[PDB]
Amino acid sequence: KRCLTNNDFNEFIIEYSKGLTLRRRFNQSSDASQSLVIKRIWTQIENLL
């Protein structure tokens, strides 16, 4: 919802996937086999694209 809103702020993509890139590195400091968290940063990836 932040994405289409403003820029996404850009911080609502930039800082939002910065402080979410924290927990997207919960999904990257190990992954096995958190298809939940993999689905999380998966949709983060598709939205960022």
């Binding site: 800082e15 402080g19 919960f26 400091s29 939940l36």
Partner: protein, 672 residues
């Protein structure tokens, strides 16, 4: 930016996916976390409900079990008499032993087989210590012919475990004081080399099992290869001395489950093929009720094209491939360790008996296993968007519910997941189509009534036409949702219970909630909507409601009571009296298989509404003359004067209509 932890297999992913598969992890929700709290309270009342259900009630059901179980305490109460009988014979006879051998007693003077030999009677500890036949009679092995590593070096490793390596001396006895320093350290050093040999034979032979993908799927090379692993798990020292042989059966098969699990994962999800739009088959279950009954049926039972196994194929395939995730994983109950039991010295009995079935086979155990997640979620999540099912698939998904009673496998939990393919398969059970019947009886009343605002008259000038669609050709799917509930649903059966029906109360909401949805058709109760109403209800109630399996009978005579009450209102300016009520009021529906002239689409002979209003107002209202006409005919006087020869007393009776609203001699006696 604040890079978080190493998410490597925490307290989640143990079906926390399937936990979050309540509704969706589709954005996201903490609202759905509250929904999880609601399902948690639902389980709380279902489990307190199970608690007081079983707390005195089915704790007396457990006393109803104590018929058989206190009966086992009754033959076992003869075992109390056999146990006090043998314990009384040996109690008094052993007291006779206490006075008999111990005449002096003085056991060093009366029973000195062990008082001369306080340690010398326990002098059979000469098999110390190591390590000749530990690695000579097993190179890696010398086995696979009930040979010296099966018959002897195995049992020599049982002598490595007969040697209690930490019960060394008790130095007044001193059997293995320094012999126990390297007895099973060289027997478990050489058998640590045989242990790494069977570990490399486990990753190697199980990588050959990963190459073994014989016939849909089948890992038969892993079955004959599993015959080459029963000796490794029998191997009684014991066999996993430090949880290692089972780690060659499980932690080695950890990645080698995912070769079979990845195999079924990419395998089973590829059978996708479907239709597009089947109004033809609803014209075959609309053509069924046309030439029925009233004729020879029509349907056969006809289609029901879903009865062709587009998804019922997996009911014997992905329940069988699910029975590879379960029942050939219950042939991984021939490969868990196997079945570690039993050989006992150390490969003696499984040197002979190393041939399991294993599946399935009964139920008396307690165990746990894995390797059934993605085949189950693949079978159900594949079967998800299935909106025609499970109406015709009532006994299919309920046979799936009642699939596995008597095994000791998790196929019951699969059958409970296949009950979840009936029950957590959501309200389909589709009574939200009744919400589409009232919600689309109100928010779609701006199209059907847009031709039918005046429907049964012409004051607001509209034709009596609205339509019965939803559920018009869904009444055709009552014969198509009911026809394939006896062939397709019956050919989806299994063990206890599973059709065996016995089941399919869905399929009784095809009576109950179909007369509730048909009560929304009673809330949908125009004269092509009265005509389509009773024609749609009786388009289900000509064959499907007598086989008499429905409950919309009073709905059919209720909407058909609105067809009598609104077809003699649409013809309330026409019949009057019976001159349009037989061939022009009901036969605007009977031969159909503004409402003054608007029954002229079929307009069954004779005296239709195109002549009952015109050729009765054209020198016929009084008579051809005036009281009365010289015509009792069947061509044009049926609109004019045979109508008057069918409504003769209805002249004065119709003139009496002004005799209450706003004496009777000069009209009702001498009407000419």
């Amino acid at each position: 930016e604040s890079k978080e932890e190493i998410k490597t297999m925490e307290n989640i992913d143990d079906e926390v996916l399937l936990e979050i598969l309540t509704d969706i992890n589709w954005s996201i929700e903490d609202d759905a976390d509250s929904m999880i709290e609601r399902i948690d309270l639902r389980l709380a009342e279902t489990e307190y409900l199970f608690n007081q259900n079983l707390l005195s009630l089915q704790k007396i059901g457990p006393n109803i079990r104590p018929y058989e179980d206190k009966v086992n305490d009754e033959c076992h109460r003869i075992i109390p008499t056999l146990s006090l009988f043998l314990m009384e014979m040996s109690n008094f006879s052993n007291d006779i032993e206490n006075v008999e051998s111990q005449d002096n007693g003085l056991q060093v003077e009366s029973a000195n087989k062990k008082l001369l030999w306080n340690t010398l009677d326990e002098l059979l500890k000469t098999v110390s210590l190591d390590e000749i036949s530990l690695n000579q009679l097993l190179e890696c092995p010398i086995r696979e012919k009930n040979l010296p590593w099966m018959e002897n070096q195995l049992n020599l490793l049982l002598k490595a475990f007969q040697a209690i390596g930490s019960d060394g001396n008790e130095v007044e006895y001193n059997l293995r004081e320094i012999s126990g320093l390297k007895q099973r350290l060289q027997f478990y050093e050489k058998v640590t080399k045989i242990f790494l040999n069977r570990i490399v034979e486990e990753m190697q032979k199980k990588f050959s099992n990963i190459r073994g993908q014989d016939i849909s799927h089948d890992q038969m090379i892993r079955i004959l290869t599993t015959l080459l692993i029963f000796s490794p798990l029998i191997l009684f020292c014991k066999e996993i001395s430090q949880k290692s042989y089972q780690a060659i059966v499980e932690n080695w098969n950890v990645s080698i489950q995912p070769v079979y699990m990845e195999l079924w994962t990419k395998k089973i999800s590829q059978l996708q093929g479907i239709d597009t739009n089947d109004e033809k088959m609803n014209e075959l279950s609309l053509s069924q009720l046309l030439n029925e009954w009233d004729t020879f049926r029509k349907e056969r039972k006809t289609n029901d094209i879903n009865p062709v196994f587009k998804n019922s194929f997996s009911l014997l395939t992905e329940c069988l491939q699910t029975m590879r995730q379960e029942c050939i994983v219950y042939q991984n109950f021939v490969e868990v360790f196997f079945h570690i039991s039993s050989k006992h010295n150390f490969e003696e009995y499984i040197k002979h008996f190393n041939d399991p079935d294993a599946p399935p086979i009964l139920l008396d155990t307690v165990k746990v296993m894995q390797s059934d997640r993605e085949a189950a979620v693949i079978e159900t999540q594949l079967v998800s968007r299935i909106f025609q099912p499970i109406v015709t698939r009532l006994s299919s998904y309920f046979v799936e519910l009642v699939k596995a009673e008597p095994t000791v496998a998790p196929a019951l939990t699969f059958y409970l997941e296949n009950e979840i393919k009936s029950l957590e398969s959501s309200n389909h059970e589709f009574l939200l189509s009744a919400v589409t019947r009232m919600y689309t009886q109100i928010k779609q009343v701006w199209s059907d009534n847009v031709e039918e605002q005046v429907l049964h008259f012409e004051r607001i000038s509209n034709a009596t036409t609205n339509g019965e669609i939803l559920p018009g050709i869904l009444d055709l799917p009552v014969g198509l949702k009911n026809s394939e509930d006896l062939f397709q649903f019956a050919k989806r059966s299994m063990d206890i219970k599973d059709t065996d029906e016995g089941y399919e109360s869905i399929e009784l909401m095809n009576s109950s909630f179909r007369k509730l949805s048909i009560a929304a058709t009673r809330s949908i109760t125009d004269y092509m909507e009265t005509i389509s109403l009773l024609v749609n209800s009786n388009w289900l109630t000509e064959m499907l409601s007598m086989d008499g399996i429905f409950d919309t009978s009073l709905q059919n005579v209720k909407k058909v009571f609105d067809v009598e009450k609104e077809s003699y209102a649409s013809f309330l300016l026409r019949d009057t009296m019976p001159k349009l009520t037989a061939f022009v009021y009901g036969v605007s529906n009977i031969i159909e298989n503004r409402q003054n002239l608007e029954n002229i689409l079929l307009a069954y002979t004779s005296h239709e509404i195109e002549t009952l209003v015109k050729r009765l107002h054209t020198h016929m209202v009084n008579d051809f003359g005036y009281h009365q006409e010289n015509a009792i005919n069947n061509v044009l006087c049926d609109k004019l004067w045979s109508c008057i020869q069918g409504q003769t007393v209805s002249l004065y009776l119709k003139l009496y209509t002004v005799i209450d609203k706003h004496k009777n001699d000069i009209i009702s006696a001498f009407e000419e």
